Design an enzyme around this catalytic site. Structure first.
Site, PDB file in Angstrom:
ATOM      1  N   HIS A   1      -5.827 -13.316   4.514  1.00  0.00           N
ATOM      2  CA  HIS A   1      -4.748 -12.381   4.220  1.00  0.00           C
ATOM      3  C   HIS A   1      -4.279 -11.722   5.520  1.00  0.00           C
ATOM      4  CE1 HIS A   1      -8.511 -10.169   4.500  1.00  0.00           C
ATOM      5  NE2 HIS A   1      -7.772  -9.157   4.946  1.00  0.00           N
TER       6      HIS A   1
ATOM      7  N   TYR B   1       1.385   1.703  -4.032  1.00  0.00           N
ATOM      8  CA  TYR B   1       0.235   2.582  -4.244  1.00  0.00           C
ATOM      9  C   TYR B   1       0.370   4.007  -3.719  1.00  0.00           C
ATOM     10  CZ  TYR B   1      -2.161  -1.843  -5.384  1.00  0.00           C
ATOM     11  OH  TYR B   1      -2.487  -3.080  -5.911  1.00  0.00           O
ATOM     12  N   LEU B   2       1.208   4.194  -2.692  1.00  0.00           N
ATOM     13  CA  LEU B   2       1.420   5.489  -2.032  1.00  0.00           C
ATOM     14  C   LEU B   2       0.168   5.850  -1.239  1.00  0.00           C
ATOM     15  CD1 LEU B   2       3.131   7.695  -4.767  1.00  0.00           C
ATOM     16  CD2 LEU B   2       4.040   5.713  -3.482  1.00  0.00           C
TER      17      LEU B   2
ATOM     18  N   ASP C   1       0.774  -1.225   0.000  1.00  0.00           N
ATOM     19  CA  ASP C   1       0.000   0.000   0.000  1.00  0.00           C
ATOM     20  C   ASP C   1       0.812   1.284   0.000  1.00  0.00           C
ATOM     21  OD1 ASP C   1      -1.505  -2.329   1.464  1.00  0.00           O
ATOM     22  OD2 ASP C   1      -3.036  -1.063   0.605  1.00  0.00           O
ATOM     23  N   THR C   2       1.876   1.281   0.785  1.00  0.00           N
ATOM     24  CA  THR C   2       2.733   2.448   0.906  1.00  0.00           C
ATOM     25  C   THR C   2       3.692   2.535  -0.282  1.00  0.00           C
ATOM     26  OG1 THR C   2       2.640   2.363   3.346  1.00  0.00           O
ATOM     27  CG2 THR C   2       4.497   3.590   2.346  1.00  0.00           C
TER      28      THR C   2
ATOM     29  N   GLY D   1      -8.538   1.175  -2.879  1.00  0.00           N
ATOM     30  CA  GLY D   1      -9.553   0.374  -3.536  1.00  0.00           C
ATOM     31  C   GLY D   1     -10.713  -0.004  -2.631  1.00  0.00           C
ATOM     32  N   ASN D   2     -10.770  -1.282  -2.269  1.00  0.00           N
ATOM     33  CA  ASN D   2     -11.829  -1.801  -1.393  1.00  0.00           C
ATOM     34  C   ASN D   2     -11.633  -1.422   0.084  1.00  0.00           C
ATOM     35  OD1 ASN D   2      -9.636  -3.697  -2.104  1.00  0.00           O
ATOM     36  ND2 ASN D   2     -10.471  -4.934  -0.415  1.00  0.00           N
ATOM     37  N   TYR D   3     -10.384  -1.429   0.542  1.00  0.00           N
ATOM     38  CA  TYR D   3     -10.048  -1.133   1.949  1.00  0.00           C
ATOM     39  C   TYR D   3      -9.759   0.333   2.286  1.00  0.00           C
TER      40      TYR D   3
HETATM   41 CU   LIG Z   1      -8.301  -7.808   6.174  1.00  0.00          CU
END
Ligand SMILES: [Cu+2]
Ligand SMILES: [Cu+2]
EC number: 1.4.3.21
Lengths: 620, 620
Positions: free
Chosen positions: B423, B294-295, B290-291, B372-374
């Site tokens: 996950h 995707y930043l 993520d970091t 996105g989803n999260y």
């Molecule tokens: Cu989760």
């Protein structure tokens, strides 16, 4: 009304009247413990029968008795005389605590010890502590307290800053005799004061703190009914209070649609032990069973609106019995309020263009108690999402000693010459489970790592495994933080819409458990504290992990004896006993007064609901 | 004046101007990352040289570049061309994500797959995810994205409720070619909607929640000066914001009397990996950095008052650069506020008759991001007693799949036929330590149990041990919750009044670390995630545990490479990298929208102060 209502002053007075009428409570008798019993296993049962259990001490030295009376019927259900040397002494009486310093003040061995240290007896406070069970054969059957000295220089002085190390006295509080005075040697008595209210120590008080006003313009969202019946955001429960255990939660249930679903029948902190790890003879016997020996509810504080409980608070003032059977109210001893809890759920969806944000909140039920130098807050939390959590807050003044010249492996230095022996604060939460009813089972769930190879060629797969604890013999479990070990309590006969037994998962903090050598007195007396989780088959006489009589009682009762029955716990009426605590190596930052430190556990629904139970939460 | 101030819109425009002028920002050039550089180690920096680091992608396939410009001088300090096949690809651009669905929509193999499932291509959303590095040699040096399909029945519909399993596509986002379309087989597309805003699903909304108002009649107790400099209850720090890392805290220090004592030079979440444990080829490559890839700061949400941040809030609206160098403000992307934190310290003393109670408070600095989803909330807390804490809150919509007929060891069922691959969400907190300055060391502290015997005849003694990590080769540590393992960062040259090196103790939650097989690509690429604690010698170019160019790097970059230097860390300028995360086996309760779950860690003073730092807090 509700059989779970709090004991009233009238009921207490009536129990006293019944015991008196039965010839069980004459002038030399003292109530060492009195508490209402929970209704027997029944869906309502044969009408109301409020029964109270009482431990009756005899100051003349006659054998004590354990008595159950039906306040409803004005009868004594049973009254048994106790052989304390075998089954344990009754909890310590408040009056017995006061005896210790008084008796020692006129004992010549004590005065000699004090004179050797140049201490004025009038300024020597004595911490009268439980004795436990060691090598002193003369103590068997006798009610002993061990006293440790602290110098109090003036009235508002905090004596804890001035321990008188190298000295300990044992006192028979019934015969009023000083049985032994041990002096291992003179130690300088730490001189710096620890007066946290003294401007000389505090310096000018901060003027930088602006007010934070927490208000509820329309009042709280919970309703209190029948005195202690709480209903808040789908939750339903009864807030009980026992002199030994303190706040007890009964009938924790959640309204899922049109059905009130049970989750936990009874939740309480059944025992709390604070073992010390300094091998010095002066303190090597020190182990506070705060719940079992002292009775934490007896010492519950009256909470002040503003600083103790901030916001819109609804208080309960539980009633307990004094040593003579008269009712005594603990004004504002229980705080109840709901507090904002940040974000509940949030999602900004690119595809739908919908941004959703909901806030969380929790119902709080708490009380604070003072056990000599320490003060502990017991907090139970109920969240909108169905999570249940308990949090213990330890604060107060740490127990001191002299700091040995050449340093110490079991004591840390807090101030010049001032030491703080290493110790733990371990709790046992007794959770009488009722996941959608009483047919429950417990599974230990561990994360399972998989090897890269056929079927997992990229070595990214990971799984989980669940092991049903079927018999009590295989239900004494330890933590495994490394494998993310948790315990799921499910109802094998109640499935969610996906055809899975509904459940709740217990998340432990995985703190170290009892550190003492397994062959020690404390490991045997606090056997529950040596393992993280115990599951037992419910029985009305299995109430505390340490048994009914902890005071000067050896091993032989409690959880280890219960487990031996090896009863069936696979889809039965079961009880979960979770051990969790703090291991303390006192820091300078903990002196002169300890900032709150916390420990706890929580249970989150695990396939209990058919989807998130918070979809109906408004935007607000 | 502060060299830690947030980048201005104008400074971004300035970098853009400089770049284009140097002929580095042509029509085919794209800024994949832009961020101001932290001041270098320099005790008395007089000549302020505000620099920015920029990663320039070339849409024509020409080698990208890492460029450093001085906005102060208006020059290009450096411009290095990158061999991405060696050092990794640059972060994915939003426009590249966008091209995936569009491209697939005209691909025959894709349309063939959709037709077989009777899915209208116009309703199929594609989740364009990072590719990682696997067995596709032809991908080396190429910028790939892997797309997973989700059906969106209508505009305000939540596509996540409808994964299209058995299908995955690989897309070269520069050549704009679909390199592969894998269809392992048809799986029913989950039919139920997960529309949490649909009254059909939510049912009538609760009307039981009464308002809880949190106000500050006199405003906040903290001061914000220089735009991002915070002063609150003796704490001092600078709140920075980077597009890769998000909120970054600089110069965390505590005013102890006269001295402003540094504690942490820089605190940030330097990486966050979300690896999936489903061995299906459709998802066995799924790992969000993520970091790094995707930043997280790029996707920070504009928080709403009263919704995301309740009470008296002070916002910061950081500015980031778009793909073309134009500054874009994230209005109200950062919340700053102080909140009540219950009891700080309490003691009701029998002997002195003094009843003392004080309230706690925490300064909160947070932001929320959406990947996105999260959706993830990053919260930093500063407490009155000197405790520093970080908390990550995970929400959003869980990533779905089909739930296999016959169950699965790697996926859980959320709704009929709806699966949720197992996950983890693992973070890496990079703590550039400065305990009373930069001369620091780290000790691993374990609780030590002792055997009953000579010197411990009652078997009650317990101690602790500390092992100094001297070299980087011995600074890769794992948790041991069982022995209460913690890590203390001390300054061996700064001692408290009791002559002991001042220190801070890191308390980890001891959650499981990366579960993937050690030989997996994800273990190699996110090696930081396999251990709980890492200590490295500070180096200005060692910023991320995963390296500078995470996207499609083969493995071993970041931490394991730094550690290989085996430098001296015993009393040196060091950096602590703490790995912590949530291991997720999604529950039915996480669907249709996940209630917040949390993870974190905290550091408490350990002999840092000479006594409690909160003795001057007023009664209120
Ligand atoms: Cu989760
Ligand atoms: Cu303690």
């Amino acid at each position: 009304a509700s059989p779970f209502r709090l004991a009233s002053a009238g009921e207490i007075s009536e129990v006293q009247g019944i015991l008196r009428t039965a010839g069980l409570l004459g002038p030399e008798k003292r109530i060492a413990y009195l508490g209402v019993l929970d209704p027997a296993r029944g869906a309502g049962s044969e009408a109301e029968d409020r029964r109270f259990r009482v431990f009756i001490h005899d100051v003349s030295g006659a054998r004590p008795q354990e008595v159950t009376v039906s306040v409803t019927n004005g009868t004594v259900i049973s009254a048994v005389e106790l052989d304390t040397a075998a089954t344990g002494e009754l909890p310590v009486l408040e009056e017995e605590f006061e005896v210790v310093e008084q008796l020692l003040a006129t004992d010549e061995r004590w005065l000699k010890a004090l004179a050797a240290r140049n201490l004025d007896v009038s300024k020597v406070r004595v911490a009268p502590l439980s004795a436990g069970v060691f090598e002193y054969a003369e103590e068997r059957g006798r009610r002993i307290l061990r006293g440790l000295a602290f110098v109090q220089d003036f009235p508002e002085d905090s004596a804890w800053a001035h321990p008188v190390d190298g000295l300990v006295a044992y006192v028979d509080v019934v015969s009023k005799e000083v049985t032994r005075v041990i002096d291992t040697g003179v130690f300088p008595v730490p001189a710096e004061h620890g007066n946290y209210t003294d401007p000389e120590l505090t310096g000018p008080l901060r003027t930088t703190q602006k007010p934070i006003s927490i208000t509820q313009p329309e009042g709280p969202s919970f309703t209190v009914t029948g005195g202690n019946h709480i209903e808040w955001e789908k939750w339903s429960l009864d807030v009980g209070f026992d002199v030994r255990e303190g706040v007890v939660l009964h009938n924790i249930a959640f309204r899922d649609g049109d059905r009130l679903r049970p989750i936990i029948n009874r939740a309480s902190i059944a025992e709390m032990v604070v073992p010390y790890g300094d091998p010095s003879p002066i303190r090597s016997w020190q182990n506070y069973f705060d719940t079992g020996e002292y009775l934490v509810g007896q010492y519950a504080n009256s909470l002040e609106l503003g600083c103790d409980c901030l916001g819109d608070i609804t208080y309960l003032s539980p009633v307990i019995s004094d040593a003579f059977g008269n009712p005594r109210e603990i004004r504002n001893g229980i705080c109840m309020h709901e507090e904002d809890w940040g974000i509940l759920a949030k999602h900004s969806d690119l595809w739908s263009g919908i941004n959703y944000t909901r806030r969380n909140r929790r119902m709080v039920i708490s009380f604070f108690t003072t056990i000599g130098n320490y003060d502990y807050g017991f907090y139970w939390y109920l969240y909108l999402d169905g999570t249940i959590e308990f949090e213990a807050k330890a604060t107060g003044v740490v127990f001191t000693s002299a700091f040995p010249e050449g340093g110490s492996d079991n004591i840390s230095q807090l101030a010049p010459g001032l030491g703080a022996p290493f110790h733990q604060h371990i709790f046992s939460a007794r959770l009488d489970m009722a996941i959608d009813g009483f047919t429950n089972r417990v599974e230990e769930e561990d994360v399972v790592r998989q090897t890269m190879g056929p079927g997992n060629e990229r070595g990214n797969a990971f799984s989980r495994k669940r092991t049903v604890l079927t018999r009590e013999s295989e239900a004494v479990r330890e933590a495994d933080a490394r494998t993310g070990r948790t315990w799921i309590i499910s109802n094998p006969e109640s499935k969610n819409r996906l055809n899975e037994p509904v459940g709740y998962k217990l998340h432990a903090h995985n703190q170290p458990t009892l550190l003492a050598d397994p062959g020690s007195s404390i490991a045997r007396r606090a056997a529950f504290a040596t393992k993280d989780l115990w599951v037992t088959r419910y029985a009305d006489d299995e109430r505390y992990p340490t048994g009914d009589f902890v005071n000067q009682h050896s091993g032989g009762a409690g959880l280890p004896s219960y487990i031996a029955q090896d009863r069936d716990i696979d889809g039965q009426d079961i009880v979960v006993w979770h051990t969790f605590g703090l291991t303390h190596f006192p820091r300078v930052e903990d002196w002169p007064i300890m900032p709150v430190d916390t420990v706890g556990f929580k249970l989150r629904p695990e396939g209990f609901f058919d989807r998130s139970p918070v979809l109906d939460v408004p935007a607000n």
